Design a protein around this ligand. Structure first.
Ligand SMILES: CCCCCCCCCCCCCCCCCC(=O)OC[C@H](COP(=O)([O-])OCC(O)COP(=O)([O-])OC[C@@H](COC(=O)CCCCCCCCCCCCCCCCC)OC(=O)CCCCCCCCCCCCCCCCC)OC(=O)CCCCCCCCCCCCCCCCC
Ligand SMILES: CCCCCCCCCCCCCCCCCC(=O)OC[C@H](COP(=O)([O-])OCC(O)COP(=O)([O-])OC[C@@H](COC(=O)CCCCCCCCCCCCCCCCC)OC(=O)CCCCCCCCCCCCCCCCC)OC(=O)CCCCCCCCCCCCCCCCC
Ligand SMILES: CCCCCCCCCCCCCCCCCC(=O)OC[C@H](COP(=O)([O-])OCC(O)COP(=O)([O-])OC[C@@H](COC(=O)CCCCCCCCCCCCCCCCC)OC(=O)CCCCCCCCCCCCCCCCC)OC(=O)CCCCCCCCCCCCCCCCC
Ligand SMILES: CCCCCCCCCCCCCCCCC[C@@H](O)O[C@H](CO[C@H](O)CCCCCCCCCCCCCCC)COP(=O)(O)OCC[N+](C)(C)C
Ligand SMILES: CCCCCCCCCCCCCCCCC[C@@H](O)O[C@H](CO[C@H](O)CCCCCCCCCCCCCCC)COP(=O)(O)OCC[N+](C)(C)C
Ligand SMILES: CCCCCCCCCCCCCCCCC[C@@H](O)O[C@H](CO[C@H](O)CCCCCCCCCCCCCCC)COP(=O)(O)OCC[N+](C)(C)C
Ligand SMILES: CCCCCCCCCCCCCCCCC[C@@H](O)O[C@H](CO[C@H](O)CCCCCCCCCCCCCCC)COP(=O)(O)OCC[N+](C)(C)C
Ligand SMILES: CCCCCCCC/C=C\CCCCCCCC(=O)OC[C@H](COP(=O)(O)OCCN)OC(=O)CCCCCCC/C=C\CCCCCCCC
Ligand SMILES: CCCCCCCC/C=C\CCCCCCCC(=O)OC[C@H](COP(=O)(O)OCCN)OC(=O)CCCCCCC/C=C\CCCCCCCC
Lengths: 121, 53, 459, 107, 140, 56, 347, 70, 54
């Protein structure tokens, strides 16, 4: 799946207009919570490296780290969801337009299929 | 990798110098202008694989 | 399943914000509470499983291992309290953090509905154990041990990963449920032979198999007491759990492919039992005994019959408890004598009688005295092997005899005879040590009252 | 040889400390007697009193979700029916042969 | 290039033992010459004549190993009357390994060469039988 | 003494709160797997006069 | 040098790379490479000493040769098709010359010999820039023309690079040579997936750059260029050694760390193409990288080495300069495995 | 009492397993379908994927060129 | 104990791996820093690439 040359793709556009047709990630998305947790860990490591009280040195700095991580994570999640939606859209369209390559196989039940039996002895 | 700034902005930084059939000074034609023009018109939008075949 | 995972995660902030003199008390209390919570996964079904979500599921193979894993952490904290007393607060908190991280990885490993998620957590367990061995080990060989313990594992685990992703490219899923329901026979081909080997060798090296068992005596002798406890009790059982899970897609190729591993196990159990007879180190002896028991478990899994699987589950649980107890007893001796040589401190029954009783009970349960669950697993595996071939009884009986021999040899060398004269620093045993031994041993004798709880999903 | 025969400045290896000396009734948990006593108490209460007794009682009275009693009652009624009706107890075929379509060999 | 590959593969496995031995000797000599060129480029030992002596030694050793492998594997395939078995290539491969050990004059290197070259030869035979691709073309 | 031991014994409350949060999260994750509720061939049942869902 | 001059030279390096990545004409790509080469030399020679001058000379020679080969390939491709646009190569001989030139620019085996030499010669900041920013342009050009590359040659050079990095890092006591060989092995991992998925190449590049930035910044903070010098760091700043050890665990590809993400994905991708043997050899060879990372971790944080008396004085002082992006780099290079599917962002 | 206060009925786990199995089966079949679709697009080039650029025909100059024959 | 566990099982997997990797590392890393040899190797591999992959 190389979508770099996919037709009608604006060159440097992070989120196209059609991506607005998709449900946005919820603010309590577990991935957003993990991005906030990553920002919190960055704040703790920042306090530790500068030889400051790790948990309670700069509350404004830790808040800024968490907020920036959540902001970027929200936009990244939107782009990720949009790209997966494009992949599924293209796959379904291709299967629809090429019926001879994706045939409808015959329904067979197990009572009329012979599988070899291998005893465990 | 390739960031198509020219296409986004419509600038034409270096596209004027890529092919023989593209607006030479004083309307001087390339030696193979017709062949290149035909090959480019054949393969436009079709994509690399289909153009190759 | 998050009702167990989240409290384990909360163990970390509670540890790091604890007072300098309150870390052990709080960690022990809340670990015991987490064990009590996890004890309610034993309510299993005769139907499929306890499928909590798309990510985690519970089984009557998973639940006993999960309960044992939760129960092991408080005991490890009690055992580590003594030799880490002169340690800084930050480093004690880091040690407790390593223990909590290892528990979290094990808990998520045992549920892990996905084979890739199982692989990721199965290998994530490798890091905290390595740090514990190479950081808080006493001898200079710990580093070397860690190297062995690492590379052996990865030598088996990188092929598995390749095979794993390959399978998903052909099957389309690595979910245990879809894998089980959509299983198809594996043809007798070179490609399938190498896929079988890639699937098996990762779990085979961790049991360990007799040929690939060299890392284990090193790692156990070099590790601190908690490291030895978790290695012998839980980490060895990851291979058994993985083999039982993955052998579902390896049929009927297991019938042919199992012969070299069956021969290696049936002969190496005799070999390691005999090695135990000439051993000058307690920890090394207990490690070799563990190798013998896990050889029997490998035979059980390779035979692949209902009685084999029941016996393998019972033996894994029983060995975990017994080996942890044995390591704890040896460590109580070592913290007094600082030698770890069996012949040095002698006649300890005269000086420490209750600890001699603990030694006797641990030796009896390692010896597989009925109706202990050790013998339940032993006997089920032996019966399955007899049905597999009547000539296996020779090797099984020899293994039983040699096991009784070295167990009672270890008991008699350390507890009986005359005390060493020049050793005068042997203090009365502490309430902490006696309680540690009791908390190891009472669960075993309680489990013998309800064996079906540890007999697995084929019960 | 002007060397001191000393490779480096090192602390001497200390002698191990006895918890029974400064505190009889030491319980082997901690050098602080109060913390020691309370660590003993919490270990004993949460390990023996709570988990070991209440957990064992909980496991002993776990409801029959493995369906052993249900299976025995089903087998009892099934045997009662088959004995009375003359049917040959258990059958050799697990599935009804009429709903199996075998492949003809014709060889 | 791939000319020698076609030369070796075109011959039937159980026939034309001399032609297989010749092709294997050619491949071994080429590999030895390339290794000698690498060694000369990275490490000039002492001089022109000693260097060309080293190159000759390497080429002859590699060609002898290839000859022994090819002849032994082809003979085993012909006598066993069971073509397309990796056991024949295992036997031939470490006949070549044993000859390498004899040339180097060391029992340990001889045993290691038998192990590792028999295993490699059997693996190559398995890959030929099953169609394993070392350099896979992009399909997906 | 209240408001003093709280600053010293506050850590103890975390394990139980984590357990309650995990129970709530388990229920929340359960709520998104109801595609077959009262739809299996085995337990397809008619609703009671004052029942909305067979399980929660 | 003058800080204004240094800023101008850095911006010229970046502008050369950006000119390579935004242009569609082969001549403009060549010009971008030339501009980058021209502004790179004083940055490597910023701290004037004979070692840095030797390193700058070696780098200039290798990069100028690579540029000449690149222009040769461009001219051959123009001869066989009057095309200046970066797309298809149109000739087997022009594609081989182009792959050789880009491999020499990247440091892929067999053109790897200059990387340890230059990295050891230059300082830690110059090595940081050299091993992070200088890979963006050749890899972008390779990503553009990947459908032209002969997979045999690219895979051969990738496997050679992985093997050489693994074996060459085992013998090193200098930290800069360790970084150079790690870079060589990671380049090998990156170029083995170009024929199949350029997205995985870009993901591997991003992860490698994050880990390398964290590693170099940790090395600069605890200003050590030698293994024994790094063994003294615990007695002043043990948290730095702990972060370094976790970063080295991540660099070795151990799960659940971030460094496991690329290789895993790469292996995964290569199995979709019925390629089994090569990923297996790649992982088994990366075990060597993990081994020497573990040796460094033993020497740094897992054991405590002897110190010196004068270290006590260093206990009384704090760093005057602090790195703003070091904590973020550490967290990103350690704990982003749960965020793996975000690679669909086509990073 | 234990069943009433700590556990739920069998239908809950049964139907949760049914839903989980459906989700996983559809994911597996989608993975196979996507692999086949990717292979077809890479081989044939007629799909939206693997579209490699060709020269834009808007660059061509269509004017008299000082020589009648172009 | 001694013959198999302490010697031969040790010789086979771990010791052989250590020896092989040590020799390979010593071979690969030992370059005297002479760019003459480096560029001679470069020429050899260039001609091999031209004569081998097309
Ligand atoms: C036989 C029935 C008895 C019923 C009475 C109830 C007994 C309850 C015991 C529960 C388990 C024991 C706990 C382990 C720790 C030991 C306690 C301790 O610290 O001692 C201090 C305490 C105070 O004395 P002290 O002077 O202060 O201490 C000085 C030193 O300690 C020195 O002390 P010492 O010199 O006096 O020695 C200590 C003593 C205690 O140390 C031990 O070794 C005890 C553990 C022995 C088991 C070894 C492992 C093998 C696995 C078997 C599993 C059985 C468990 C069944 C279920 C258990 C439920 C939790 O060791 C012995 O005396 C050797 C006994 C060898 C027993 C071998 C026989 C095994 C099979 C017997 C049949 C079982 C099933 C029957 C089924 C068919 C019929 C219904 O002494 C005792 O209380 C002694 C305990 C009594 C001896 C136990 C032997 C029989 C009990 C078997 C288990 C339960 C049977 C259930 C069936 C009932 C019908
Ligand atoms: C996995 C679970 C448990 C497994 C357990 C462990 C199993 C794995 C390890 C076992 C490996 C043992 C055998 C392989 C290595 C032995 C060779 C060696 O190490 O060379 C170093 C060593 C080289 O040292 P050196 O400095 O060159 O000379 C020192 C001697 O004094 C110079 O010797 P000399 O001048 O006195 O005379 C040499 C003569 C000596 O022969 C005799 O005198 C009578 C022998 C007939 O040799 C012969 O005639 C050839 C026979 O070789 C020897 O010294 C002994 C060579 C003869 C040993 C033959 C061993 C029997 C082969 C059995 C192979 C089965 C396993 C391997 C399978 C192969 C295909 C897969
Ligand atoms: C599975 C995922 C789930 C778990 C996530 C795990 C990761 C999360 C955290 C990630 C990193 C963030 C924090 C790390 C910064 C380090 C700071 C530090 O040094 O600690 C001192 C600091 C206190 O000491 P201090 O007096 O301020 O200053 C002492 C100096 O910092 C320095 O002290 P010193 O100089 O006196 O002592 C020197 C010491 C100092 O060196 C260190 O402390 C090492 C720091 C850890 C390295 C971080 C690497 C980056 C992340 C890697 C994560 C790896 C996970 C993957 C699995 C592999 C396992 C290794 O170094 C050594 O002794 C060298 C020997 C060490 C042995 C070998 C090294 C192994 C380290 C591996 C640790 C991995 C887990 C760390 C967990 C956090 C530890 C604080 O500890 C803390 O308090 C921070 C802990 C977090 C605070 C939590 C606050 C929240 C509580 C209330 C909210 C409740 C939550 C729920 C809400 C709802 C309730 C109602
Ligand atoms: C004579 C008595 C015999 C029986 C003994 C019973 C012993 C009970 C204690 C053992 C409990 C085993 C572990 C159970 C953990 C899981 C239980 C969990 O599932 O229940 C949750 C509730 O958890 C309980 O509150 C946990 C109780 C923990 C305490 C156990 C008793 C020991 C506590 C000791 C505390 C000591 C503190 C210090 C005192 C000084 C709510 O479940 P929920 O997901 O809604 O279920 C949905 C189905 N419903 C709606 C029908 C319920
Ligand atoms: C070291 C510590 C313990 C580590 C673990 C050891 C366990 C690994 C052992 C591997 C299991 C056996 C491998 C293959 C078993 C298949 C049976 C086959 O080998 O035997 C004959 C095969 O004949 C020959 O054996 C061919 C193979 C010969 C080459 C193998 C080298 C022999 C010794 C090497 C052992 C080294 C092992 C360790 C390597 C590092 C059968 O005849 P045939 O009907 O034709 O083949 C049927 C199978 N088909 C249909 C797929 C083709
Ligand atoms: C010092 C000497 C002793 C003095 C005291 C004298 C009295 C001694 C008497 C006690 C021992 C004699 C044995 C008699 C057994 C009676 C109890 C037994 O009958 O109950 C068993 C019950 O025991 C439990 O099932 C087994 C104990 C549970 C084990 C859990 C371990 C505790 C958790 C801690 C974590 C450990 C981790 C281990 C990893 C798995 C079996 O019950 P069961 O016939 O079925 O049905 C129960 C009733 N029903 C029908 C309503 C259901
Ligand atoms: C390694 C860990 C992540 C570190 C990444 C750096 C974090 C800071 C970056 C801050 C945001 C950068 C985004 C720039 C704003 C707009 C960008 C937009 O204009 O460009 C789009 C491009 O968007 C970016 O490519 C996506 C960037 C997202 C990178 C994150 C994915 C990392 C993998 C998941 C690991 C977990 C990391 C999460 C924690 C940070 C369109 O590009 P296009 O011209 O059409 O195609 C050229 C590229 N091709 C050829 C490869 C297709
Ligand atoms: C290193 C190179 C290993 C060579 C082994 C080759 C095996 C192989 O390629 O099989 C691939 C096979 C399917 O065959 P295909 O090529 O896809 O198609 C065939 C039908 N047309 O796919 C797989 O199963 C891949 C599984 C990984 C292969 C195993 C690689 C390592 C060897 C097996 C593991 C045993 C060693 C473990 C070491 C233990 C040390 C403690
Ligand atoms: C293709 C290539 C595959 C490469 C596979 C590498 C396996 C990982 C082991 C790497 C070790 C190589 C380096 C080495 O051993 O150096 C010798 C080194 C010397 O120690 P140093 O601290 O470096 O310094 C000594 C002088 N002061 O020796 C040792 O210490 C080794 C101690 C630990 C041994 C580890 C054993 C690992 C191998 C076990 C079996 C699995 C190997 C992997 C492949 C198995 C095949 C399926």
């Amino acid at each position: 799946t190389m979508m770099s040359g996919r037709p009608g793709r604006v060159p440097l556009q992070f989120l196209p207009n059609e991506a607005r047709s998709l449900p946005p990630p919820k603010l309590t998305d577990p991935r957003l919570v993990y991005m906030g947790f990553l920002g919190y860990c960055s704040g703790l490591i920042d306090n530790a490296i500068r030889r400051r009280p790790v948990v309670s040195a700069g509350l404004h700095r830790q808040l800024l780290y968490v907020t920036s991580f959540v902001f970027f994570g929200y936009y990244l999640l939107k782009r990720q969801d949009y790209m997966y939606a494009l992949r599924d859209h293209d796959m379904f369209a291709y299967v629809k337009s090429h019926p001879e390559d994706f045939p409808e196989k015959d329904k067979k039940t197990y009572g009329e299929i012979l599988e070899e039996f291998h005893p465990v002895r | 990798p390739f960031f198509d700034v020219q296409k986004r902005l419509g600038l034409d930084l270096d596209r004027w110098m890529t092919i023989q059939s593209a607006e030479q000074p004083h309307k001087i034609p390339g030696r193979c202008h017709a062949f290149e023009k035909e090959w480019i018109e054949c393969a436009h939008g079709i994509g690399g694989i289909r153009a190759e075949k | 399943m998050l009702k167990i995972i989240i409290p384990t995660t909360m163990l970390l902030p509670m540890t790091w914000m604890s007072k300098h003199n309150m870390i052990w008390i709080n960690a022990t209390v809340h670990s015991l509470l987490i064990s009590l919570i996890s004890l309610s996964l034993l309510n299993q079904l005769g139907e499929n499983s306890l499928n909590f979500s798309l990510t985690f599921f519970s089984d009557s193979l998973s639940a006993p291992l999960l309960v044992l894993t939760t129960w092991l952490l408080p005991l490890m904290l009690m055992a580590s309290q003594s030799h880490l007393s002169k340690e800084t607060t930050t480093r004690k908190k880091l040690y407790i953090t390593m223990l909590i991280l290892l528990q979290l990885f094990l808990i998520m490993t045992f549920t892990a509905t996905e084979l890739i998620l199982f692989y990721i957590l199965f290998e994530a367990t490798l890091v905290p154990t390595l740090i514990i061995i190479t950081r808080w080990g006493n001898q200079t060989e710990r580093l070397n041990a860690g190297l062995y313990f690492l590379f052996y594992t990865l030598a088996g685990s990188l092929p598995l990963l390749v095979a794993l992703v390959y399978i998903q490219n052909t099957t389309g899923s690595l979910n245990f449920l879809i894998i089980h329901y959509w299983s198809h026979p594996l043809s007798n081909s070179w490609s399938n032979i190498f896929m079988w080997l890639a699937c098996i060798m990762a779990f085979m090296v961790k049991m360990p198999l007799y040929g690939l068992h060299l890392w284990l005596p090193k790692a156990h002798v070099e590790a601190p007491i908690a490291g030895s406890m978790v290695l012998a009790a839980v980490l060895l059982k990851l291979g058994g759990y993985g083999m039982m899970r993955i052998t579902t897609i390896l049929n009927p190729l297991t019938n042919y492919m199992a012969y070299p591993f069956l021969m290696l196990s049936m002969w190496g159990m005799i070999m390691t039992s005999s090695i135990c007879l000439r051993q000058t180190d307690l920890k090394s002896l207990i490690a070799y005994s563990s190798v013998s028991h896990m050889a029997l478990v490998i035979v059980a899994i390779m035979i692949q019959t209902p009685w084999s699987f029941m016996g393998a589950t019972a033996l894994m649980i029983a060995h975990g408890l017994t080996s942890s107890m044995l390591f704890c007893l040896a460590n109580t001796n070592y913290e007094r004598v600082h030698s770890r040589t069996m012949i040095l401190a002698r006649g300890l029954q005269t000086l420490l009688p209750l600890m001699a009783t603990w030694w006797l009970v641990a030796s009896l349960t390692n010896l597989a005295l009925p109706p202990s669950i050790n013998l339940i697993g032993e006997l089920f595996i032996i019966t399955a092997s007899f049905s597999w071939s009547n000539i296996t009884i020779i090797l099984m009986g020899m293994n039983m005899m040699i096991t009784a021999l070295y167990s009672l040899y270890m008991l008699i060398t350390t507890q009986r005879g005359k005390y060493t004269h020049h050793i005068n620093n042997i203090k009365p045993s502490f309430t902490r040590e006696n309680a540690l031994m009791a908390l190891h041993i009472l669960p075993l004798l309680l489990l013998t009252l309800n064996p079906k709880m540890i007999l697995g999903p084929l019960y | 040889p002007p060397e001191p025969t000393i490779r480096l400045q090192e602390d001497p290896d200390p002698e191990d400390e006895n918890l029974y000396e400064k505190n009889p009734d030491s319980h082997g948990y901690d050098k602080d007697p109060i913390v020691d006593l309370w660590n003993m108490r919490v270990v004993f209460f949460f390990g023996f009193s709570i988990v070991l007794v209440l957990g064992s009682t909980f496991v002993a009275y776990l409801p029959d979700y493995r369906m052993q009693e249900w299976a025995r009652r089903e087998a009892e009624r099934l045997v009662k029916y088959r004995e009375a009706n003359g049917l040959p107890l258990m059958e050799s075929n697990c599935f009804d042969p009429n709903k199996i379509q075998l492949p003809e060999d014709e060889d | 290039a791939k000319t020698l590959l076609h030369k070796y593969s075109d011959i039937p496995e159980g026939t034309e033992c001399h032609r297989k031995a010749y092709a294997s000797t050619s491949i071994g000599g080429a590999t030895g010459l390339i290794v000698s060129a690498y060694s000369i480029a990275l490490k000039p030992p002492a001089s022109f004549l000693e260097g060309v002596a080293r190159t000759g030694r390497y080429t002859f050793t590699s060609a002898a190993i290839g000859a022994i492998f090819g002849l032994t594997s082809c003979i085993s395939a012909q006598v066993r009357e069971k073509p397309d078995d990796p056991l024949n290539y295992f036997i031939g491969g470490c006949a070549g390994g044993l000859t390498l050990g004899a040339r180097t004059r060391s029992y340990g290197i001889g045993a290691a060469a038998c192990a590792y070259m028999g295993l490699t030869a059997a693996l190559v035979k398995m890959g030929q039988l099953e169609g394993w691709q070392v350099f896979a073309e992009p399909k997906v | 003494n209240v408001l003093q031991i709280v600053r010293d014994h506050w850590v103890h409350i975390l394990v139980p709160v984590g357990f309650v949060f995990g129970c709530y999260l388990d229920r929340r994750s359960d709520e998104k797997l109801t595609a077959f509720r009262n739809k299996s061939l085995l337990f397809k049942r008619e609703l009671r006069p004052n029942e909305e869902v067979t399980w929660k | 040098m003058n800080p204004i001059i240094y800023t101008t030279l850095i911006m010229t390096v970046m502008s050369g790379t950006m000119l390579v990545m935004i242009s569609s004409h082969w001549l403009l790509i060549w010009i971008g490479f030339e501009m980058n080469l021209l502004a790179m030399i004083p940055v490597l020679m910023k701290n004037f000493n004979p070692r840095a001058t030797e390193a700058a000379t070696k780098y200039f020679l290798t990069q100028a040769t690579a540029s000449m080969m690149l222009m040769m390939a461009i001219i051959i491709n123009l001869l066989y098709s009057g095309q200046w646009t970066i797309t298809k190569m149109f000739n087997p001989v022009a594609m081989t010359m182009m792959t050789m030139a880009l491999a020499m620019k990247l440091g892929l085996s067999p053109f790897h010999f200059w990387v340890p030499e230059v990295t050891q010669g230059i300082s830690l900041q110059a090595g940081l820039l050299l091993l992070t920013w200088q890979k963006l342009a050749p890899l972008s050009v390779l990503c553009q023309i990947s459908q032209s590359i002969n997979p045999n040659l690219m895979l051969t050079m990738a496997m050679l690079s992985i093997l050489i990095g693994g074996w060459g890092g085992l013998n090193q006591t200098q930290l800069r040579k360790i970084m150079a060989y790690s870079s060589i092995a990671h380049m090998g991992w990156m170029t083995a997936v170009l024929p199949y998925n350029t997205t995985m190449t870009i993901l591997n590049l991003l992860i490698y750059i994050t880990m390398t930035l964290a590693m170099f910044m940790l090395l600069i903070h605890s200003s050590a260029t030698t293994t024994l010098s790094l063994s003294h760091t615990w007695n002043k700043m043990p948290v730095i050694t702990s972060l370094m050890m976790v970063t080295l665990l991540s660099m070795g590809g151990l799960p659940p760390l971030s460094g496991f993400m690329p290789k895993w994905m790469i292996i995964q991708e290569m199995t979709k193409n019925e390629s089994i043997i090569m990923p297996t050899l790649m992982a088994m060879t990366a075990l060597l990288n993990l081994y020497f990372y573990m040796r460094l971790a033993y020497s740094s944080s897992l054991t405590m080495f002897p110190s010196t008396n004068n270290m006590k004085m260093k206990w009384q002082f704090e760093h005057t300069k602090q790195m703003k992006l070091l904590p973020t780099m550490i967290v990103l290079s350690t704990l982003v495995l749960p965020m793996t599917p975000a690679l669909s962002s086509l990073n | 009492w234990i069943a009433r206060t700590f556990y739920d009925g069998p239908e809950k786990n049964y139907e949760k397993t049914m839903a989980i199995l459906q989700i996983e089966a559809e994911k597996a079949e989608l993975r196979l379908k996507e692999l086949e679709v990717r292979r077809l697009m890479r081989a044939r080039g007629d799909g939206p994927w693997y579209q490699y650029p060709t020269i834009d025909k808007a660059l061509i100059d269509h004017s008299p060129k000082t020589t009648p024959d172009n | 104990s001694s013959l198999l566990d302490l010697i031969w099982l040790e010789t086979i997997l771990p010791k052989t791996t250590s020896f092989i990797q040590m020799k390979m590392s010593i071979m690969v890393s030992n370059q005297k820093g002479l760019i003459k040899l480096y560029f001679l190797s470069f020429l050899i591999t260039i001609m091999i690439s031209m004569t081998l992959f097309n």
